[PDB]
Design an enzyme around this catalytic site. Sequence first.
Site, short mmCIF file in Angstrom:
data_model
loop_
_atom_site.label_atom_id
_atom_site.label_comp_id
_atom_site.label_asym_id
_atom_site.label_seq_id
_atom_site.Cartn_x
_atom_site.Cartn_y
_atom_site.Cartn_z
N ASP A 337 0.87 -1.22 0.02
CA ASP A 337 0.11 -0.11 0.01
C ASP A 337 0.83 1.09 -0.09
OD1 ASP A 337 -2.42 1.26 0.04
OD2 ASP A 337 -2.31 1.76 2.36
N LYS A 448 -10.66 31.40 -4.97
CA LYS A 448 -9.35 30.82 -5.34
C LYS A 448 -8.11 31.39 -4.66
CE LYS A 448 -10.99 31.08 -9.26
NZ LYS A 448 -12.47 31.32 -9.71
N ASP A 678 -1.89 -0.82 5.95
CA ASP A 678 -2.21 -0.13 7.24
C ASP A 678 -3.89 0.24 7.26
OD1 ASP A 678 -2.21 1.98 5.62
OD2 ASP A 678 -1.69 3.45 7.07
N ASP A 682 -7.21 -2.73 3.05
CA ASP A 682 -5.90 -3.84 2.74
C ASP A 682 -6.47 -5.05 3.58
OD1 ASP A 682 -3.92 -1.85 1.49
OD2 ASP A 682 -4.47 -1.10 3.40
F1 ALF Z 1 -2.62 3.78 -0.08
AL1 ALF Z 1 -4.24 2.99 0.78
F2 ALF Z 1 -5.49 2.06 1.37
F3 ALF Z 1 -4.75 2.55 -0.92
F4 ALF Z 1 -3.56 3.38 2.40
MG MG Z 2 -3.36 3.37 4.29
#
Ligand code: ALF
Ligand code: MG
Lengths: 984, 34, 268
Positions: A337, A448, A678, A682
């Site tokens: 990740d 902006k 994390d 995941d």
């Molecule tokens: F980068 Al991710 F779940 F896709 F922490």
């Molecule tokens: Mg993450």
Amino acid sequence: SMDDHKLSLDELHRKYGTDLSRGLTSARAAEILARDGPNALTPPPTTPEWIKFCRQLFGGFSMLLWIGAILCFLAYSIQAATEEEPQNDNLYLGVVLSAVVIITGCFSYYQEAKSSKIMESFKNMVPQQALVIRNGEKMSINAEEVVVGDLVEVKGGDRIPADLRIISANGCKVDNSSLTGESEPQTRSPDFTNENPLETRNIAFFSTNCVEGTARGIVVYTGDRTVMGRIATLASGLEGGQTPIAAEIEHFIHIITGVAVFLGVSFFILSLILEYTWLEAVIFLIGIIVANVPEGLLATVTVCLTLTAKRMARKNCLVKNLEAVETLGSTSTICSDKTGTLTQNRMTVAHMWFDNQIHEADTTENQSGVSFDKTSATWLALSRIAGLCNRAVFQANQENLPILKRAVAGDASESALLKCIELCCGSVKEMRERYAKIVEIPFNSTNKYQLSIHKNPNTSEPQHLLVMKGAPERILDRCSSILLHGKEQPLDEELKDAFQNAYLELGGLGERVLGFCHLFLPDEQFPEGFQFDTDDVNFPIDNLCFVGLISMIDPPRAAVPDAVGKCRSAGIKVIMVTGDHPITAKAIAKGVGIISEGNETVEDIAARLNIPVSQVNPRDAKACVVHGSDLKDMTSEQLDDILKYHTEIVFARTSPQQKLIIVEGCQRQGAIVAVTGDGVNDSPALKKADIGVAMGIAGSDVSKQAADMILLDDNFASIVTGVEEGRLIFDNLKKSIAYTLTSNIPEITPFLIFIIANIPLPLGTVTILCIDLGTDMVPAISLAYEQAESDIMKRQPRNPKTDKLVNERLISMAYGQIGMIQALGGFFTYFVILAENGFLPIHLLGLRVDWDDRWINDVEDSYGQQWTYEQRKIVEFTCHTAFFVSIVVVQWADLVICKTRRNSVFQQGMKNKILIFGLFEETALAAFLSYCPGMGVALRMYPLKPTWWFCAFPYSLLIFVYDEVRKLIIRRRPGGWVEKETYY
Amino acid sequence: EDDPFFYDEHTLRKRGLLVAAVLFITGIIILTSG
Amino acid sequence: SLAEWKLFIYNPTTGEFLGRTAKSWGLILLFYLVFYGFLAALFSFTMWVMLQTLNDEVPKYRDQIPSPGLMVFPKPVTALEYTFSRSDPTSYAGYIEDLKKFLKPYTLEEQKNLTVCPDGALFEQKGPVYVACQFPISLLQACSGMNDPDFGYSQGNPCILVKMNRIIGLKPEGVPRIDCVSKNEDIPNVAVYPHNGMIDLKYFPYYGKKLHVGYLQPLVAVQVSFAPNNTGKEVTVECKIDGSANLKSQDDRDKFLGRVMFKITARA
Ligand code: ALF
Ligand SMILES: [Mg+2]
Ligand SMILES: CCCCCCCC/C=C/CCCCCCCC(=O)OC[C@H](COP(=O)(O)OCC[N+](C)(C)C)OC(=O)CCCCCCC/C=C/CCCCCCCC
Ligand SMILES: CCCCCCCC/C=C/CCCCCCCC(=O)OC[C@H](COP(=O)(O)OCC[N+](C)(C)C)OC(=O)CCCCCCC/C=C/CCCCCCCC
Ligand SMILES: CCCCCCCC/C=C\CCCCCCCC(=O)O[C@H](COC(=O)CCCCCCC/C=C/CCCCCCCC)COP(=O)(O)OCC[N+](C)(C)C
Ligand SMILES: CC(C)CCC[C@@H](C)[C@H]1CC[C@H]2[C@@H]3CC=C4C[C@@H](O)CC[C@]4(C)[C@H]3CC[C@]12C
Ligand SMILES: CC(C)CCC[C@@H](C)[C@H]1CC[C@H]2[C@@H]3CC=C4C[C@@H](O)CC[C@]4(C)[C@H]3CC[C@]12C
Ligand SMILES: CC(C)CCC[C@@H](C)[C@H]1CC[C@H]2[C@@H]3CC=C4C[C@@H](O)CC[C@]4(C)[C@H]3CC[C@]12C
Ligand SMILES: [K+]
Ligand SMILES: [K+]
Ligand SMILES: [K+]
């Protein structure tokens, strides 16, 4: 699929039978609750702990030992029913075998996965109360009682109870980190925005929290029907399967069990043919079974795994499943990740552009790197503007913390600027005290930019300055000067071109850029006391002095780039799977080393060649960025092509199911896949992976419940440490298994020679048990404390199909050369003992029938003396003790030679203090068993004459010299015949 | 005067147990060295 | 349902037999043959060296056989229990055959070349000739083959030989003898024929099979008498040595050290 956001406001209400504002009738809601069920997740049934133990008690060796114990009890029963004067030896042997099976089952139970609590962690995210509009009134109810198709109001930090089709919102923003892994708030509006309901703005998902604003929604899914409910059900129902070490263990268990069964059945039929009685045949079968089975091998493997798991716990690397200490070493692909795993999950100032030059800041969490130059007046002005135009402020009662590790109440970019200012110059609180605010203008969608007015730095009453922040490409339209080195210089076309080039340079790094400019009051035309609070004042803001640009990115962790490089050098392919957008994912992949220099995607190649991506051959690109939308409709074979023809692969904007699909596709190619993450998205990938690694501080509860290993200090170099430890423990397990197996032959051969040559038995079952459960435990375990012979991080990952833990080369050595030398040494000792007492070796042939006859008490030796049954039995038991001692003595050199596989003991050395202690403890235990009073009745061990200890010395020296010469022959001629046959 | 049919088994047991104790203590010393 | 082992053996590609080609099998078998030949040669040399240090006349150690056991002859078929019938000659034929074979060297025809030694005195022979005293079979009267071919059998009075185990260099003290008494309360008559046991001292010490050629160990013959009409079967008689303190007979672990117990069953 199954989208309700397409439905209009009227169509949605009529489909569910819910009023626009009155909500749902209480009786109707109760009816739906009865028909549909509670708004809760159903945890899967769990196996009782006593069932797992019973399963562990039926291993391949456990079945053989159970058969041995049953045969021991049968032998005792037959002996009792025949002679009415039983000896309680076979009964005790059966009890001891049963105890050995039970203890091995306990060891295997410890060395086993301890299930998961994923559903409990998911239920922890279900809110306790939910506000539901029923009968036109706001009433707080349990979130479990929420039904499909009723108004739900969420506001300011309330977790979303179910899946909501949002129909009204007042600046509602939600944290969708449970779906994408990104904590950036997403605006929620009733309007239909995206075809995919995962990115549409009118759908609010269960397990997310509304960070700010209020919203009204119609429940469309409830309980397990919700998006995260399906993910929880999938994650809980998934298993990691069989670990590589478990597969290797079952493989060598099958090998040894086959050998044992073959020998046992063949020699049992042989004993029956030779007219053995049932009792004698059963005794012989028990002896063969006990000699063939390594009784302490599996417990030794568990102890080695425990030792290497406790070795890594000293490096802040918690191992939850004991089998995971080897999977990382066996890993060939890592699917990592991005957010919180490769990056720090914190917006951080990365690059700045002032004085017509790009400045790089230190983005590490420990601030160990070098910083830019703080000796510039325009830099002082830029820092003032950046840290003084912020609205975010530090929270209280956290001053005893590193600056980068303190929570800030504000926007992510605002917090990044605040922390950068704290690191670089002074304190934002004191600087705001110095320059008191008098009026501000917040950020707006059509504006902006943000501007503020405060007191001057020059102490002059008439003077004031107006700091401004906003979009970079719109801020220069309101600027007419650029401050270089503290000097106000007018706008130049070349300077505008340089600004555009810098904006592209910083923007192309996946970093969001903000501009800063300040304007000093020209003269007394605007006095200090003038009220700026007059809204819509006729004071257009123009001709400001531009200062610089600041770019903010989620930076990689300090150890991530080097660790990724080392993992790739170790032959491990690193794949990036993230729920973030492709541009940031590709930028981080380039930064951390997932995509190396010189490798370009097909899109980059097409852009370089100034052609559309269709006319360029995809095989020219070794790197690729695959989007979740492209992956959604991509078949299994097409995904296999991506994983096969691309060395640098990045997956972006992936749903939690798509991470699982990627992991399954990587595993389909016969790869051991490690997944590091994390977030709760995941968790299915962590469960499906061969080993799942979770972060300690950053990881959520679900991620660490679904993992096999937890990095407690969030150190990513611990992955490299883990792969090195896994490779080392694989090698050391080979050494320990060879050492344990080679001593089977000195226990098996005496029974075969007994049945073939009809000599008195050289070894008893009790002595075999004393060798395995006793003197061979500490020496075998001591191989776990063995250092690497060479650089194990240079070799490629082992092929699970081909590189087996126990193969024919290990069996060749252990069962054919070293074991045979040990058996010859033991037999020489046996013959010495019997010849020194009157029975010459030629006299022993065919003497088994008379020797074992309890009623023949005049058996004659070679000198004419006649022996009673008990006297010659004492001689035979002394032979058994001497055979035991000889096995120990040859196991000395066996341990020394099993210490290494290719290196000589002279090169490697004897620094393993556990192994020397193992030798000393083994010898001391053997001497104690031989010479302790009362062991002649307990285990039938009898004291040996001092000269009888040295009978096996020639064979131990022969073992040592032989294996040293063989290792020398392996080191020379690396591809030779000796290595192909004997190098295990 | 030597006598057959007799061996000093008890002295052998003393010496064997002493050697076993010495070996075990040496192994402990080598193990816990520092 | 897949026969993967079909291609494992006799693989058409490369001719791999169980994963090894014909050349590989030949080389590995040649290596193992040479390796095992070298191991056998070393084992044989070590055995020869060990045997060259041993004495051919006296065993190196005799501490495991310090006292003689006591054994009966002939050895019965099962459990040292003598079972026979008076009327059927084939029931006790094996016992008579064994007794005749054992007592052939003890007849005066074979031992006419031996020497006569004085009674009651231990016969120590330091010389190298090592003559052997003769044991005349007349001492086992009514239990020798000279008086009757049937050794008490076919008459209801079976004769069983009791002998002391030979030990090299053992000199019994006092006056060795073997007494036999019936264990049952019925006490059928048992007759040790050479008066008492009377293991005379002139037959000791035994000097070994190699040196003391022609040795004949002393024999004690026990005769268990039965009534004609009353079978008197299931009689148990125990013998032991009760003349020498040097020869132990009260060992609990060894029920044959200095004593022997056997059962006689008679039919018809
Ligand atoms: F980068 Al991710 F779940 F896709 F922490
Ligand atoms: Mg993450
Ligand atoms: C790894 C490779 C494997 C290869 C295959 C292995 C196969 C092993 C199978 C073996 C079974 C053999 C067949 C059964 C035994 C023989 C049959 C029989 O005819 O046997 C009758 C018995 C024994 O008489 P004999 O023939 O020896 O006599 C002969 C006279 N002679 C000996 C004095 C000269 O008669 C008696 O004496 C006893 C009467 C019965 C008393 C016991 C009851 C039997 C039950 C036993 C189960 C105990 C289980 C305990 C579990 C406890 C768990 C806590
Ligand atoms: C006290 C007494 C103790 C007695 C101990 C006896 C021990 C018996 C144990 C045998 C097990 C041997 C195998 C152990 C490992 C099994 C699992 C394994 O990891 O194994 C791998 C191979 C598969 O090989 P592959 O296809 O990948 O090969 C590729 C080419 N490579 C070889 C160069 C890589 O499996 C194999 O080798 C399987 C080979 C099995 C061979 C067993 C028969 C041995 C008999 C030999 C006598 C000769 C008979 C044939 C004569 C032919 C004359 C021409
Ligand atoms: C016939 C009788 C039975 C035969 C048994 C056959 C097996 C054992 C025979 C030989 C093994 C000799 C091992 C030599 C190791 C030194 C190599 C070297 O030179 O390493 C040296 C260092 O070592 C040491 O400090 C430790 C020395 C310990 C000596 C232990 C002595 C006791 C061992 C006894 C085993 C024998 C069996 C006894 C059983 C127990 C009875 C109570 C030099 O290394 P360095 O520090 O310069 O390099 C370091 C840097 N680096 C590696 C990167 C280059
Ligand atoms: C006492 C002695 C004679 C027993 C002899 C056992 C021999 C015949 C057995 C035991 C171990 C066996 C070996 C085990 C491993 C292998 C590797 C395999 O790829 C080829 C067969 C081979 C080489 C076997 C050959 C036969 C073998 C050597
Ligand atoms: C040569 C090196 C490598 C290892 C040497 C091991 C030696 C020193 C050790 C191991 C076991 C020990 C023996 C253990 C038991 C006895 C019985 C005792 O009554 C005399 C000493 C004696 C015989 C010891 C002598 C020393 C001994 C043989
Ligand atoms: C390596 C090969 C050549 C062996 C060389 C060493 C040989 C000759 C030595 C080493 C160990 C020695 C044996 C050690 C123990 C005994 C028991 C005792 O009764 C003395 C002889 C005997 C049997 C020795 C015979 C000679 C012997 C076998
Ligand atoms: K074993
Ligand atoms: K897993
Ligand atoms: K073993």
